[PDB]
């Protein structure tokens with residue numbers, strides 16, 4: 001049908017059709033009479049997977065022959081989503097499979113909807129890992145993703161009576177055709193025990209053993225025949241584990257204790273919980289990965305070349321134990337001296353920070369590390385002592401610097417600051433957007449920056465244009481390809497060429513046509529799968545991201561209530577109709593976040609059923625926001641809400657997805673918004689609110705929310721509506737916690753930005769009244785979104801951190 005989806009040649013369609021039938025028969029043990037749509041999905045998945053295998057085997061054998069420097073991306077999260085369509089796109093198989101399935105009498109799109117998301121992540125951090133793997137494969141890097149194979153990923157969110165309910169995400173229920181178990185590569189991981197000092201070195205003894213079994217998933221590059229590996233560890237009990245009948249039975253049942261390590265993803269976004277099971281997960285992935293890394297290095301004795309052959313990227317502090325674990329292996333097992341081992345460690349490791357919020361920093365109680373990892377604690381103390389000697393030598397007599405920079409935090413409970421550990425043990429520390437990276441140097445890691453300025457870098461985040469344009473928005477990718485060709489898909493800077501089409505009437509019409517098609521398709525999805533009815537001619541105002549106070553879904557809520565109140569005050573006045581969509585999961589134990597969801601649904605309950613409002617204002621809560629839902633809603637959006645308090649959102653990546661897909665952005669000068677506005681031009685962006693400097697000034701003076709309440713009559717009315725029970729007639733005080741928080745304990749200054757926000761929102765409405773000028777501003781956004789490709793991000797990591805050259809050259813098919 002469309003060009004960017006590849007050729008549907010006669011030879012290929014015939015080959016796919018017969019491989020499909022082969023798999024249906026031999027692999028699924030079915031015939032066309034008993035086959036369900038799920039069987040059809042699986043036959044297609046297996047047929048497409050067969051095209052990866054050759055490339056996968058030859059890529060890995062290529063790395064063995066050429067022996068390049070390997071990149072190990074260590075993360076607790078890989079938010080992959082669905083794999084079928086992405087594999088077809090990267091293999092240029094999409095049209096062929098569409099044709100082949102059409103001829104068999106099937107709709108491929110319907111089959112695609114059957115695949116479960118691999119929801120092995122919470123949000124932005126996990127999705128960055130996923131985009132990164134794609135870019136690393138596309139740029140021909142010998143890269144490996146290492147993580148945990150959670151049996152249960154992020155929970156499925158159900159909305160019941162407006163309240164979030166969590167249910168287990170049993171994503172492996174029907175099996176995973178993309179993964180290959182590698183039980184022959186099973187590795188032991190040790191916990192507990194004690195430290196024994198001998199004539200020659202310390203020894204970690206009397207440990208409990210858990211087995212780590214790897215499962216390899218292929219990561220195909222974009223049409224370069226490169227297929228890299230994501231290796232995920234699963235926890236297994238050894239067969240002598242815990243080993244009377246009742247006693248024998250119990251011993252076997254207790255194997256579950258060991259295997260609980262890889263059972264479930266911790267669903268806590270932007271807050272730190274010092275739970276023992278979480279620490280076990282962190283060590284588990286670190287220990288298994290480092291043994292695998294070293295084994296591979298040895299099968300190429302001299303660890304001086306180790307940093308020339310190995311890069312380890314730490315996705316936040318979650319795999320921070322890699323630092324003392326590498327020290328442990330090099331000192332205790334390989335018998336290298338401390339100083340040499342340390343040189344190797346630092347040159348091997350690099351650390352990426354993803355937030356400045358203090359409650360997010362990992363600070364593990366010493367008593368936990370003592371019990372679980374006694375040797376690692378000793379190594380940490382030793383690292384800390386040697387590090388503080390360097391600080392003392394550099395800043396003599398500066399005693400408070402010493403305690404500020406210590407890896408060990410004194411207090412009621414001693415803790416290890418894992419961020420401090422990462423900086424000390426890494427040759428590079430980066431933030432994820434320019435403003436975030438500067439904030440790291442000027443505030444939370446200022447002392448470390450003063451000691452080692454060369455260590456600190458920026459690597460502005462990015463998103464993969466494969467999943468986030470070609471895959472989710474084929475209509476937009478096609479009209480672009482018509483004008484400038486297909487090369488931009490792996491060279492997103494080329495979109496600048498669209499700037500010469502901003503006055504092109506055919507292109508304007510096409511861009512606007514594609515958006516309306518996406519909106520009609522999404523409006524239909526809402527009706528079909530959720531029985532909710534929206535006006536496709538309204539402005540699609542969307543805020544999709546995890547629910548957190550800093551992201552200020554509450555500020556969005558206030559605006560929504562303002563629009564409603566204004567409508568009710570002047571019913572027969574014209575207003576640009578809006579469909580306001582808010583979606584996102586709340587962490588299970590985060591009361592305020594759960595209250596915000598309830599508020600959003602409660603507003604919808606009032607707004608959507610007011611006859612006076614009509615189809616002019618609709619408030620919808622998008623249930624179960626996840627990667628596959630993002631691929632649907634983002635192409636349909638007109639307005640992207642990126643309204644975090646300045647200084648709180650490290651980068652954001654959702655913002656970039658929207659920019660790439662033809663939505664305009666309303667947002668604060670926060671995270672990557674700043675660089676987006678700079679790329680597109682500030683006049684093509686809806687910027688409002690306090691800047692970072694403004695937030696600082698308000699903090700120095702003290703934020704008094706009462707002041708805004710007293711001076712803004714429209715804001716006062718909304719607060720009184722909330723308190724009086726206007727949005728909860730049967731539970732009048734339901735939102736008392738929200739009001740109290742806003743009025744007395746708002747860390748994120750919702751009221752301070754309210755006026756500028758509402759005003760700016762009026763400017764959005766005004767522009768939307770002029771379809772031609774809206775669309776031209778859209779084109780200016782799409783055309784300048786090239787910087788935000790994760791191909792750019794990864795090439796910067798490769799060149800400035802890892803010391804490797806990306807390559808766009810094909811491997812032979």
Ligand SMILES: O=C(Nc1cccc2ccccc12)C(=O)N[C@@H]1O[C@H](CO)[C@@H](O)[C@H](O)[C@H]1O
Pocket residue numbers: 122123124125126128266268269270271272354355360361432461649650651652653671
């Ligand atoms: O720090 C983040 N999450 C977490 C904070 C605290 C504890 C966590 C525990 C498990 C998983 C994520 C956690 C996070 O999601 N950071 C996000 O990283 C994205 C990718 O760099 C950025 O675009 C976002 O601005 C940032 O909030």
